[PDB]
């Protein structure tokens, strides 16, 4: 129930897995600027707004970008893949 590729860079390898309920995301230590897996239960960066410390309420489905209500305006648009939201790093026609 965790993905087989790093949500930040998209490649496989050694991945640390998110502990937040229902989150399947996993990441390279290097992509998290870490040397070892965090100690104990860990919450991945997807749940925090890109622009502040608030919890995210809207999410890019293609990378860890996500946004609180204060910062969500204009940040995400539907993509060709079932309408799943994507941030400005992706081509919505081929996310």
């Amino acid at each position: 129930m965790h993905e087989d590729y790093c949500f930040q860079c998209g490649d496989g390898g050694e991945l640390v897995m998110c502990d937040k309920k229902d989150c399947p995301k996993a990441y390279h230590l290097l992509c998290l600027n870490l040397t070892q897996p965090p100690y104990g239960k860990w919450e991945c960066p997807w749940h925090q707004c890109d622009e502040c410390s608030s919890a995210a309420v809207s999410f890019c489905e293609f990378c860890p970008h996500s946004f609180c209500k204060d910062h969500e305006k204009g940040a995400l648009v539907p993509s060709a893949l079932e309408g799943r939201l994507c941030c400005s790093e992706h081509d919505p026609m081929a996310p």
């Binding site: 087989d4 590729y5 496989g12 390898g13 991945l15 239960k41």
Partner: peptide
Amino acid sequence: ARTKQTARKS
């Protein structure tokens, strides 16, 4: 946190 080992691409 737990880690796992998966295959690299390309």
